[PDB]
Amino acid sequence: MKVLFVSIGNTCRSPMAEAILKHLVVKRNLQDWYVDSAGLRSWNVGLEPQARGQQLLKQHGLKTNHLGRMISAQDFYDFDYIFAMDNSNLLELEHMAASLTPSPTCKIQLLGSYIGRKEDEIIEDPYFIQGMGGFNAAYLQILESCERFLQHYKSDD
Ligand SMILES: [Cl-]
């Protein structure tokens, strides 16, 4: 129903994940789904996703509007899943959640743990990787991750 993707910058991995899952739920015609993304630093806040990721997305029929924003405390109460790309992200989000006095009930998880191959768990930050190889690996990891995640949430178990 409500899913938040989280990357450190909210400018590469998380906006791509947001747009990808947004596409999947329409191509699967699901309801009542809400997908968003947020970040853990002010670095790229208030800007649009990094241009070479919007290109890779367009090259797959997807587009993103998204302005980089920080995760807020409210986010932890308004989402069912919050997905980290990194174990760094995960640890910061786990510390964050435990600092909120009414403990939240969002599930906070490494998105890549749905891939099913531990050697492919980690979705690396492509921001500083020269060329497109970092974005391409991340896109594929994010796509499979979202696919297996949806397969699991619809399942009767
Ligand atoms: Cl398609």
Side-chain angles (χ1 to χ4, degrees), residues 1-62 64-100 102-117 119-153 155-157:
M1 174 186 39
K2 303 203 242 167
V3 174
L4 183 70
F5 291 110
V6 174
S7 57
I8 190 168
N10 191 208
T11 179
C12 296
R13 293 166 294 176
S14 42
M16 265 188 301
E18 177 184 349
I20 276 169
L21 181 59
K22 263 168 177 190
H23 184 51
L24 288 175
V25 317
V26 312
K27 199 206 71 65
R28 260 79 134 160
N29 202 88
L30 306 197
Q31 292 122 68
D32 198 356
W33 279 67
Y34 179 61
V35 187
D36 192 20
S37 66
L40 304 165
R41 302 285 186 279
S42 61
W43 300 339
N44 303 94
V45 162
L47 316 168
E48 284 206 308
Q50 200 191 226
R52 60 214 268 223
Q54 291 192 268
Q55 280 316 280
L56 177 55
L57 284 170
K58 151 178 270 182
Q59 158 184 330
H60 283 271
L62 302 181
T64 165
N65 39 321
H66 176 83
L67 295 168
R69 72 177 185 85
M70 297 267 340
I71 195 171
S72 63
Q74 266 285 359
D75 288 321
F76 286 82
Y77 301 104
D78 297 332
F79 288 88
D80 307 299
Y81 285 84
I82 299 176
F83 290 119
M85 307 292 151
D86 276 325
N87 200 245
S88 163
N89 307 160
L90 188 62
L91 289 201
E92 301 187 8
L93 287 167
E94 278 166 344
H95 278 72
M96 208 174 321
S99 86
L100 305 176
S103 280
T105 43
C106 58
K107 313 200 151 272
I108 299 160
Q109 304 170 346
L110 198 64
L111 165 69
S113 77
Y114 286 89
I115 289 191
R117 309 184 291 283
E119 77 271 10
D120 273 276
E121 254 202 327
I122 309 294
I123 310 196
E124 312 280 42
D125 189 350
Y127 192 92
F128 55 84
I129 295 295
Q130 205 195 313
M132 286 298 194
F135 271 89
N136 289 323
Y139 174 92
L140 294 162
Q141 273 165 309
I142 290 162
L143 180 52
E144 183 178 350
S145 301
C146 290
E147 300 216 54
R148 299 202 181 274
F149 164 68
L150 288 164
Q151 184 213 309
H152 295 25
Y153 156 90
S155 120
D156 297 299
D157 281 327

mmCIF file of all heavy atoms in Angstrom, residues 22-58:
data_model
loop_
_atom_site.group_PDB
_atom_site.id
_atom_site.type_symbol
_atom_site.label_atom_id
_atom_site.label_comp_id
_atom_site.label_asym_id
_atom_site.label_seq_id
_atom_site.Cartn_x
_atom_site.Cartn_y
_atom_site.Cartn_z
ATOM 1 N N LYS A 22 6.380 2.404 -9.331
ATOM 2 C CA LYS A 22 5.186 3.084 -9.823
ATOM 3 C C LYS A 22 4.711 2.479 -11.142
ATOM 4 O O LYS A 22 3.506 2.275 -11.337
ATOM 5 C CB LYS A 22 5.453 4.579 -9.981
ATOM 6 C CG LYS A 22 4.976 5.404 -8.807
ATOM 7 C CD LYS A 22 5.506 6.838 -8.850
ATOM 8 C CE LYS A 22 4.940 7.640 -7.676
ATOM 9 N NZ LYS A 22 5.240 9.086 -7.805
ATOM 10 N N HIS A 23 5.648 2.173 -12.051
ATOM 11 C CA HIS A 23 5.294 1.540 -13.315
ATOM 12 C C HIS A 23 4.743 0.137 -13.093
ATOM 13 O O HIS A 23 3.682 -0.213 -13.620
ATOM 14 C CB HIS A 23 6.502 1.493 -14.246
ATOM 15 C CG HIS A 23 6.200 0.930 -15.606
ATOM 16 N ND1 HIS A 23 5.160 1.388 -16.390
ATOM 17 C CD2 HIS A 23 6.798 -0.059 -16.318
ATOM 18 C CE1 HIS A 23 5.132 0.710 -17.525
ATOM 19 N NE2 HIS A 23 6.115 -0.174 -17.507
ATOM 20 N N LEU A 24 5.442 -0.671 -12.296
ATOM 21 C CA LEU A 24 4.990 -2.032 -12.044
ATOM 22 C C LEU A 24 3.550 -2.068 -11.543
ATOM 23 O O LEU A 24 2.754 -2.895 -12.008
ATOM 24 C CB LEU A 24 5.928 -2.726 -11.055
ATOM 25 C CG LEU A 24 7.300 -3.107 -11.610
ATOM 26 C CD1 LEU A 24 8.167 -3.681 -10.495
ATOM 27 C CD2 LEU A 24 7.199 -4.103 -12.785
ATOM 28 N N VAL A 25 3.181 -1.177 -10.613
ATOM 29 C CA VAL A 25 1.844 -1.278 -10.034
ATOM 30 C C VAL A 25 0.764 -0.850 -11.009
ATOM 31 O O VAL A 25 -0.392 -1.253 -10.844
ATOM 32 C CB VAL A 25 1.661 -0.475 -8.730
ATOM 33 C CG1 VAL A 25 2.858 -0.634 -7.808
ATOM 34 C CG2 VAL A 25 1.333 0.974 -9.021
ATOM 35 N N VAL A 26 1.089 -0.037 -12.017
ATOM 36 C CA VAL A 26 0.083 0.239 -13.037
ATOM 37 C C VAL A 26 0.036 -0.902 -14.053
ATOM 38 O O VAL A 26 -1.047 -1.353 -14.437
ATOM 39 C CB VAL A 26 0.319 1.616 -13.699
ATOM 40 C CG1 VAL A 26 0.546 2.675 -12.646
ATOM 41 C CG2 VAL A 26 1.460 1.603 -14.707
ATOM 42 N N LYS A 27 1.201 -1.421 -14.464
ATOM 43 C CA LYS A 27 1.233 -2.552 -15.388
ATOM 44 C C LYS A 27 0.636 -3.794 -14.749
ATOM 45 O O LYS A 27 0.175 -4.698 -15.453
ATOM 46 C CB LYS A 27 2.671 -2.829 -15.841
ATOM 47 C CG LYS A 27 2.802 -3.665 -17.113
ATOM 48 C CD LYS A 27 4.142 -4.440 -17.172
ATOM 49 C CE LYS A 27 4.193 -5.601 -16.148
ATOM 50 N NZ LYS A 27 3.193 -6.706 -16.420
ATOM 51 N N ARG A 28 0.645 -3.862 -13.420
ATOM 52 C CA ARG A 28 -0.078 -4.893 -12.690
ATOM 53 C C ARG A 28 -1.456 -4.438 -12.249
ATOM 54 O O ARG A 28 -2.182 -5.235 -11.646
ATOM 55 C CB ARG A 28 0.703 -5.333 -11.452
ATOM 56 C CG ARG A 28 1.479 -6.622 -11.613
ATOM 57 C CD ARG A 28 2.780 -6.428 -12.368
ATOM 58 N NE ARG A 28 3.854 -7.117 -11.664
ATOM 59 C CZ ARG A 28 5.010 -7.472 -12.207
ATOM 60 N NH1 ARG A 28 5.264 -7.212 -13.487
ATOM 61 N NH2 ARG A 28 5.911 -8.090 -11.460
ATOM 62 N N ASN A 29 -1.806 -3.170 -12.489
ATOM 63 C CA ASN A 29 -3.137 -2.638 -12.197
ATOM 64 C C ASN A 29 -3.514 -2.809 -10.723
ATOM 65 O O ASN A 29 -4.622 -3.237 -10.393
ATOM 66 C CB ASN A 29 -4.180 -3.290 -13.111
ATOM 67 C CG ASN A 29 -5.445 -2.458 -13.251
ATOM 68 O OD1 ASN A 29 -5.532 -1.588 -14.118
ATOM 69 N ND2 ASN A 29 -6.434 -2.726 -12.401
ATOM 70 N N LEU A 30 -2.601 -2.457 -9.824
ATOM 71 C CA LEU A 30 -2.843 -2.667 -8.403
ATOM 72 C C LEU A 30 -3.490 -1.455 -7.743
ATOM 73 O O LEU A 30 -3.401 -0.323 -8.218
ATOM 74 C CB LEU A 30 -1.547 -2.991 -7.656
ATOM 75 C CG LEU A 30 -0.638 -4.131 -8.096
ATOM 76 C CD1 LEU A 30 0.296 -4.456 -6.948
ATOM 77 C CD2 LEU A 30 -1.437 -5.351 -8.512
ATOM 78 N N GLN A 31 -4.124 -1.717 -6.610
ATOM 79 C CA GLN A 31 -4.641 -0.688 -5.721
ATOM 80 C C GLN A 31 -4.411 -1.192 -4.299
ATOM 81 O O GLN A 31 -4.204 -2.397 -4.124
ATOM 82 C CB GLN A 31 -6.125 -0.441 -5.987
ATOM 83 C CG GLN A 31 -6.427 0.195 -7.335
ATOM 84 C CD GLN A 31 -7.363 -0.662 -8.186
ATOM 85 O OE1 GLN A 31 -8.531 -0.820 -7.854
ATOM 86 N NE2 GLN A 31 -6.859 -1.185 -9.300
ATOM 87 N N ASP A 32 -4.399 -0.330 -3.284
ATOM 88 C CA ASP A 32 -4.342 1.112 -3.409
ATOM 89 C C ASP A 32 -2.935 1.503 -2.980
ATOM 90 O O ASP A 32 -2.651 1.615 -1.785
ATOM 91 C CB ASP A 32 -5.401 1.781 -2.539
ATOM 92 C CG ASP A 32 -5.674 3.216 -2.953
ATOM 93 O OD1 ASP A 32 -4.967 3.707 -3.870
ATOM 94 O OD2 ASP A 32 -6.594 3.843 -2.360
ATOM 95 N N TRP A 33 -2.059 1.690 -3.966
ATOM 96 C CA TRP A 33 -0.626 1.782 -3.744
ATOM 97 C C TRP A 33 -0.159 3.224 -3.796
ATOM 98 O O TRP A 33 -0.618 4.013 -4.628
ATOM 99 C CB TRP A 33 0.140 0.963 -4.779
ATOM 100 C CG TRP A 33 0.189 -0.500 -4.458
ATOM 101 C CD1 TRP A 33 -0.864 -1.373 -4.438
ATOM 102 C CD2 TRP A 33 1.345 -1.261 -4.112
ATOM 103 N NE1 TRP A 33 -0.431 -2.630 -4.098
ATOM 104 C CE2 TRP A 33 0.923 -2.589 -3.896
ATOM 105 C CE3 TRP A 33 2.697 -0.951 -3.966
ATOM 106 C CZ2 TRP A 33 1.808 -3.603 -3.539
ATOM 107 C CZ3 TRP A 33 3.572 -1.958 -3.613
ATOM 108 C CH2 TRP A 33 3.127 -3.265 -3.403
ATOM 109 N N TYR A 34 0.761 3.556 -2.899
ATOM 110 C CA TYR A 34 1.432 4.845 -2.896
ATOM 111 C C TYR A 34 2.932 4.620 -2.742
ATOM 112 O O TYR A 34 3.371 3.899 -1.838
ATOM 113 C CB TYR A 34 0.896 5.733 -1.780
ATOM 114 C CG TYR A 34 1.584 7.064 -1.722
ATOM 115 C CD1 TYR A 34 1.528 7.931 -2.798
ATOM 116 C CD2 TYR A 34 2.303 7.450 -0.600
ATOM 117 C CE1 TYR A 34 2.158 9.153 -2.756
ATOM 118 C CE2 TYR A 34 2.935 8.672 -0.547
ATOM 119 C CZ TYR A 34 2.860 9.518 -1.630
ATOM 120 O OH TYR A 34 3.486 10.743 -1.599
ATOM 121 N N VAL A 35 3.707 5.219 -3.633
ATOM 122 C CA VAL A 35 5.149 5.031 -3.692
ATOM 123 C C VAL A 35 5.798 6.408 -3.656
ATOM 124 O O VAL A 35 5.313 7.344 -4.299
ATOM 125 C CB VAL A 35 5.563 4.255 -4.961
ATOM 126 C CG1 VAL A 35 7.047 3.922 -4.940
ATOM 127 C CG2 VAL A 35 4.734 2.989 -5.105
ATOM 128 N N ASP A 36 6.882 6.536 -2.896
ATOM 129 C CA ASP A 36 7.560 7.815 -2.725
ATOM 130 C C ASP A 36 9.037 7.542 -2.461
ATOM 131 O O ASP A 36 9.463 6.388 -2.356
ATOM 132 C CB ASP A 36 6.912 8.632 -1.593
ATOM 133 C CG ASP A 36 7.395 10.080 -1.557
ATOM 134 O OD1 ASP A 36 7.907 10.558 -2.596
ATOM 135 O OD2 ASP A 36 7.277 10.727 -0.487
ATOM 136 N N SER A 37 9.831 8.606 -2.338
ATOM 137 C CA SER A 37 11.227 8.389 -1.985
ATOM 138 C C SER A 37 11.763 9.598 -1.226
ATOM 139 O O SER A 37 11.200 10.698 -1.278
ATOM 140 C CB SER A 37 12.087 8.068 -3.215
ATOM 141 O OG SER A 37 12.178 9.154 -4.123
ATOM 142 N N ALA A 38 12.834 9.354 -0.468
ATOM 143 C CA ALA A 38 13.407 10.367 0.402
ATOM 144 C C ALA A 38 14.873 10.023 0.635
ATOM 145 O O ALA A 38 15.349 8.952 0.238
ATOM 146 C CB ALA A 38 12.622 10.468 1.715
ATOM 147 N N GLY A 39 15.589 10.935 1.316
ATOM 148 C CA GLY A 39 17.028 10.819 1.467
ATOM 149 C C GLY A 39 17.481 11.098 2.886
ATOM 150 O O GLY A 39 16.683 11.425 3.761
ATOM 151 N N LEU A 40 18.787 10.966 3.092
ATOM 152 C CA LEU A 40 19.391 11.065 4.416
ATOM 153 C C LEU A 40 20.406 12.210 4.545
ATOM 154 O O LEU A 40 21.104 12.291 5.561
ATOM 155 C CB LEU A 40 20.034 9.716 4.766
ATOM 156 C CG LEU A 40 19.073 8.509 4.704
ATOM 157 C CD1 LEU A 40 19.811 7.216 4.698
ATOM 158 C CD2 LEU A 40 18.070 8.508 5.873
ATOM 159 N N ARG A 41 20.522 13.088 3.542
ATOM 160 C CA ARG A 41 21.441 14.223 3.574
ATOM 161 C C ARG A 41 20.808 15.388 2.829
ATOM 162 O O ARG A 41 19.979 15.196 1.940
ATOM 163 C CB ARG A 41 22.805 13.924 2.921
ATOM 164 C CG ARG A 41 23.604 12.771 3.504
ATOM 165 C CD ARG A 41 24.265 13.105 4.836
ATOM 166 N NE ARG A 41 25.107 11.991 5.233
ATOM 167 C CZ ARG A 41 24.641 10.889 5.819
ATOM 168 N NH1 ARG A 41 23.349 10.781 6.089
ATOM 169 N NH2 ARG A 41 25.457 9.898 6.136
ATOM 170 N N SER A 42 21.219 16.610 3.180
ATOM 171 C CA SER A 42 20.689 17.764 2.454
ATOM 172 C C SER A 42 21.380 18.006 1.108
ATOM 173 O O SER A 42 20.959 18.910 0.390
ATOM 174 C CB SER A 42 20.800 19.026 3.311
ATOM 175 O OG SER A 42 22.161 19.277 3.609
ATOM 176 N N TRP A 43 22.383 17.193 0.742
ATOM 177 C CA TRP A 43 23.267 17.474 -0.389
ATOM 178 C C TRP A 43 22.497 17.821 -1.656
ATOM 179 O O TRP A 43 22.651 18.911 -2.218
ATOM 180 C CB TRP A 43 24.180 16.270 -0.648
ATOM 181 C CG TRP A 43 25.049 15.905 0.512
ATOM 182 C CD1 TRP A 43 25.413 16.717 1.556
ATOM 183 C CD2 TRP A 43 25.658 14.633 0.761
ATOM 184 N NE1 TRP A 43 26.221 16.031 2.420
ATOM 185 C CE2 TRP A 43 26.380 14.748 1.967
ATOM 186 C CE3 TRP A 43 25.665 13.408 0.081
ATOM 187 C CZ2 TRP A 43 27.104 13.688 2.507
ATOM 188 C CZ3 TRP A 43 26.383 12.344 0.631
ATOM 189 C CH2 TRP A 43 27.093 12.495 1.821
ATOM 190 N N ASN A 44 21.666 16.897 -2.129
ATOM 191 C CA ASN A 44 20.932 17.077 -3.373
ATOM 192 C C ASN A 44 19.464 17.430 -3.141
ATOM 193 O O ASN A 44 18.635 17.210 -4.032
ATOM 194 C CB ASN A 44 21.064 15.818 -4.227
ATOM 195 C CG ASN A 44 22.524 15.453 -4.509
ATOM 196 O OD1 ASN A 44 23.140 14.658 -3.789
ATOM 197 N ND2 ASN A 44 23.080 16.030 -5.565
ATOM 198 N N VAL A 45 19.131 17.990 -1.972
ATOM 199 C CA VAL A 45 17.740 18.314 -1.636
ATOM 200 C C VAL A 45 17.229 19.451 -2.516
ATOM 201 O O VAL A 45 17.985 20.336 -2.928
ATOM 202 C CB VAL A 45 17.638 18.669 -0.140
ATOM 203 C CG1 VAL A 45 16.337 19.436 0.195
ATOM 204 C CG2 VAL A 45 17.736 17.415 0.685
ATOM 205 N N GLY A 46 15.926 19.428 -2.810
ATOM 206 C CA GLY A 46 15.274 20.472 -3.582
ATOM 207 C C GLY A 46 15.506 20.415 -5.079
ATOM 208 O O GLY A 46 14.912 21.223 -5.815
ATOM 209 N N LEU A 47 16.358 19.507 -5.549
ATOM 210 C CA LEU A 47 16.664 19.333 -6.961
ATOM 211 C C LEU A 47 15.969 18.089 -7.507
ATOM 212 O O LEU A 47 15.389 17.291 -6.763
ATOM 213 C CB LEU A 47 18.177 19.221 -7.165
ATOM 214 C CG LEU A 47 18.975 20.249 -6.363
ATOM 215 C CD1 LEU A 47 20.452 19.899 -6.367
ATOM 216 C CD2 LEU A 47 18.743 21.662 -6.903
ATOM 217 N N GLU A 48 16.041 17.927 -8.821
ATOM 218 C CA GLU A 48 15.476 16.798 -9.547
ATOM 219 C C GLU A 48 16.493 15.673 -9.651
ATOM 220 O O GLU A 48 17.698 15.903 -9.501
ATOM 221 C CB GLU A 48 15.039 17.244 -10.950
ATOM 222 C CG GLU A 48 13.737 18.040 -10.976
ATOM 223 C CD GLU A 48 12.997 17.926 -12.299
ATOM 224 O OE1 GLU A 48 13.619 18.169 -13.355
ATOM 225 O OE2 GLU A 48 11.788 17.604 -12.279
ATOM 226 N N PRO A 49 16.050 14.437 -9.932
ATOM 227 C CA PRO A 49 16.996 13.314 -9.963
ATOM 228 C C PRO A 49 18.116 13.578 -10.948
ATOM 229 O O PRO A 49 17.945 14.292 -11.936
ATOM 230 C CB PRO A 49 16.132 12.129 -10.405
ATOM 231 C CG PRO A 49 14.748 12.509 -9.960
ATOM 232 C CD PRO A 49 14.677 13.983 -10.219
ATOM 233 N N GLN A 50 19.280 13.012 -10.645
ATOM 234 C CA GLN A 50 20.460 13.302 -11.434
ATOM 235 C C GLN A 50 20.219 12.918 -12.886
ATOM 236 O O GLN A 50 19.661 11.858 -13.181
ATOM 237 C CB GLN A 50 21.663 12.556 -10.881
ATOM 238 C CG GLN A 50 22.947 13.164 -11.322
ATOM 239 C CD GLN A 50 24.139 12.294 -11.015
ATOM 240 O OE1 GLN A 50 25.159 12.773 -10.502
ATOM 241 N NE2 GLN A 50 24.030 11.004 -11.344
ATOM 242 N N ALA A 51 20.678 13.782 -13.794
ATOM 243 C CA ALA A 51 20.190 13.762 -15.170
ATOM 244 C C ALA A 51 20.430 12.417 -15.848
ATOM 245 O O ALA A 51 19.572 11.934 -16.596
ATOM 246 C CB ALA A 51 20.836 14.895 -15.961
ATOM 247 N N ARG A 52 21.570 11.781 -15.591
ATOM 248 C CA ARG A 52 21.838 10.530 -16.290
ATOM 249 C C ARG A 52 20.938 9.388 -15.833
ATOM 250 O O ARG A 52 20.914 8.346 -16.493
ATOM 251 C CB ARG A 52 23.308 10.155 -16.134
ATOM 252 C CG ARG A 52 23.740 9.972 -14.726
ATOM 253 C CD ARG A 52 25.181 10.423 -14.521
ATOM 254 N NE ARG A 52 26.187 9.377 -14.690
ATOM 255 C CZ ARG A 52 27.217 9.227 -13.858
ATOM 256 N NH1 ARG A 52 27.326 10.027 -12.810
ATOM 257 N NH2 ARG A 52 28.121 8.275 -14.043
ATOM 258 N N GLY A 53 20.192 9.562 -14.742
ATOM 259 C CA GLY A 53 19.263 8.550 -14.283
ATOM 260 C C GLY A 53 17.902 8.763 -14.902
ATOM 261 O O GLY A 53 17.189 7.807 -15.227
ATOM 262 N N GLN A 54 17.527 10.035 -15.066
ATOM 263 C CA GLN A 54 16.317 10.359 -15.816
ATOM 264 C C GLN A 54 16.436 9.906 -17.265
ATOM 265 O O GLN A 54 15.431 9.542 -17.895
ATOM 266 C CB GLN A 54 16.038 11.862 -15.741
ATOM 267 C CG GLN A 54 15.621 12.349 -14.360
ATOM 268 C CD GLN A 54 15.081 13.777 -14.365
ATOM 269 O OE1 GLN A 54 15.826 14.731 -14.167
ATOM 270 N NE2 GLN A 54 13.777 13.922 -14.580
ATOM 271 N N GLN A 55 17.652 9.912 -17.808
ATOM 272 C CA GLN A 55 17.855 9.403 -19.156
ATOM 273 C C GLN A 55 17.643 7.900 -19.202
ATOM 274 O O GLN A 55 16.818 7.404 -19.982
ATOM 275 C CB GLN A 55 19.251 9.767 -19.655
ATOM 276 C CG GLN A 55 19.330 11.201 -20.163
ATOM 277 C CD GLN A 55 18.138 11.576 -21.046
ATOM 278 O OE1 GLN A 55 18.101 11.228 -22.232
ATOM 279 N NE2 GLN A 55 17.153 12.286 -20.467
ATOM 280 N N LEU A 56 18.367 7.160 -18.362
ATOM 281 C CA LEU A 56 18.175 5.717 -18.301
ATOM 282 C C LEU A 56 16.708 5.363 -18.081
ATOM 283 O O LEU A 56 16.191 4.421 -18.688
ATOM 284 C CB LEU A 56 19.059 5.129 -17.204
ATOM 285 C CG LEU A 56 18.962 3.637 -16.937
ATOM 286 C CD1 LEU A 56 19.219 2.866 -18.217
ATOM 287 C CD2 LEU A 56 19.982 3.269 -15.885
ATOM 288 N N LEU A 57 16.008 6.137 -17.257
ATOM 289 C CA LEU A 57 14.587 5.894 -17.046
ATOM 290 C C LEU A 57 13.780 6.123 -18.322
ATOM 291 O O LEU A 57 12.987 5.263 -18.720
ATOM 292 C CB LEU A 57 14.073 6.778 -15.916
ATOM 293 C CG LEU A 57 14.473 6.289 -14.525
ATOM 294 C CD1 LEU A 57 14.141 7.345 -13.493
ATOM 295 C CD2 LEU A 57 13.755 4.980 -14.209
ATOM 296 N N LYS A 58 13.952 7.287 -18.965
ATOM 297 C CA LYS A 58 13.269 7.552 -20.231
ATOM 298 C C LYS A 58 13.549 6.461 -21.253
ATOM 299 O O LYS A 58 12.635 5.983 -21.934
ATOM 300 C CB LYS A 58 13.686 8.914 -20.791
ATOM 301 C CG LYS A 58 13.637 8.985 -22.329
ATOM 302 C CD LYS A 58 14.011 10.347 -22.882
ATOM 303 C CE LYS A 58 12.789 11.246 -23.037
ATOM 304 N NZ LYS A 58 13.176 12.563 -23.624
#
